[PDB]
């Protein structure tokens, strides 16, 4: 049959399971794979973020190479809101207030003068010997100090080991964060991984008792099938089949492969979106739904431009 | 600068037209292929990417009962806007039911 819009708006429901910071798990009853996969593939490659693109070095005296340091700085998540910023029009080396952000990783390593007796520990001998990302100084340009407060534009994780130094060695570079989508380069993706899975169903076609129920209790994942006592015997009943890894272990045992019908429930996807921290995870799912609408609106504008009629 | 090419089959035949959508992949090309196929006035709707070195898709739409094949394609797009808008409205109003149960539970 055809697309009854009021059959969709009656049977669709989203059931959020867990949402702390930098994680999200929700269900979607009644959406089909060709839309849910579009949400998944817009999270991984279409939702834009900010990340480092140019690196302007002076005195990389370190052991980490000049090329590998720039590639290593590219993969560091910047905690800037992407929606505030624009794409760079091609060919500008110095972007404006709106295009680019800046940083400066300026670390010099030196020996620790005092409390350096009979020890070989690096924390007691050296100062600034592990270049973390909390050594990055945001350098606002134009009027960017007014748009964002003190402490908004920032690296996300502030523990990422960039380099590792010894005395005499210096890193004095300057960065340029840009805007991009997650398929131009993988350093722009907002998500650790975004995926889904159908909710499995398990249907005991035969009542199993005794030790065969304990043999059934260990074929599935811990928490799927529960063994309960009903007057001296131990009968098994399923309980939350969401926990199942769908590993097909019951189809190895011979007498018990013909009592359960391990299949999947159609159109009952269980997403999970884990952000890298640039945006909160329930704002990344919103700006992934809102990108597919923009892809529709651009082609509707092109159809309005082709046929005036 | 353009983003959509309509290619008629035999010039006079506006029932079969292969929409060549620029800057695309299987994200919108497979969601549209699900929506245009939900039309009973469409005999056949399939898409293919041209070559993965390119980033445009083909999208064949061909109809029965004498409809020009841009009307299942406008209905193909607006009935996906109306689906993403409803998914957005049931998502943003189910996050809030979760936040306001995390707040008012033991805090």
């Amino acid at each position: 049959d055809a697309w009854d819009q009021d059959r969709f708006e009656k049977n669709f429901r989203v059931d959020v399971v867990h949402m702390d910071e930098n994680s999200l798990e929700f269900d979607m009853v009644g959406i089909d794979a060709a839309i849910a996969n579009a949400f998944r593939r817009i999270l991984l490659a279409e939702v834009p973020t900010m990340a480092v693109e140019k690196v302007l070095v002076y005195n990389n005296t370190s052991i980490v190479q000049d090329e590998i340091l720039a590639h290593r700085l590219g993969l560091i998540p910047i905690h800037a809101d992407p929606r505030l910023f624009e794409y760079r029009n091609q060919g500008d080396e110095e972007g404006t207030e709106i295009d680019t952000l800046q940083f400066r990783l300026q670390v010099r390593c030196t020996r620790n003068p005092h409390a350096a007796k009979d020890s070989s520990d690096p924390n007691e001998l050296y100062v600034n010997h592990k270049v973390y990302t909390r050594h990055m100084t945001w350098i606002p340009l134009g009027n960017q100090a007014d748009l964002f407060p003190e402490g908004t534009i920032r690296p996300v994780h502030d523990d990422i080991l960039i380099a590792q130094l010894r005395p005499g060695q210096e890193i004095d570079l300057l960065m340029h964060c840009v805007k991009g989508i997650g398929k131009d380069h993988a350093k722009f993706s907002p998500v650790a991984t975004a995926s889904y899975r159908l909710l499995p169903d398990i249907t005991l076609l035969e009542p199993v008792e005794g030790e065969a129920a304990e043999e059934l209790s260990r074929c599935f994942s811990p928490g799927v099938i529960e063994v309960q006592e009903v007057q001296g015997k131990k009968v098994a009943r399923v309980a939350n089949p969401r926990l199942d890894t769908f590993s097909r272990e019951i189809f190895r045992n011979e007498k018990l492969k013909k009592v359960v019908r391990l299949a999947r429930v159609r159109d009952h996807y269980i997403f999970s979106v884990e952000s890298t921290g640039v945006l909160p995870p329930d704002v990344l799912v919103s700006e992934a739904i809102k990108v597919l609408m923009g892809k529709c609106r651009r082609f509707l504008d092109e159809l309005d431009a082709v046929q005036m009629d | 600068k353009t983003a959509l090419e309509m290619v008629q089959a035999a010039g006079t035949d506006r029932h079969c037209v292969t929409f060549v959508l620029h800057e695309e992949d299987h994200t919108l090309g497979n969601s549209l292929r699900y929506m245009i196929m939900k039309n009973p006035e469409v005999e056949f709707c399939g898409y293919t990417t041209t070559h993965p070195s390119e980033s445009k898709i083909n999208l064949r739409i061909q109809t029965r009962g004498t409809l020009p094949a841009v009307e299942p394609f406008q209905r193909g797009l607006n009935e996906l806007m109306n689906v993403c808008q409803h998914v957005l409205d049931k998502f943003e109003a189910s996050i809030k039911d979760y936040k306001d149960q995390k707040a008012s539970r033991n805090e």
Partner: peptide
């Protein structure tokens, strides 16, 4: 595979 808190 925690159970949902927004029930049906």
């Amino acid at each position: 595979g925690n159970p949902p808190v927004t029930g049906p």
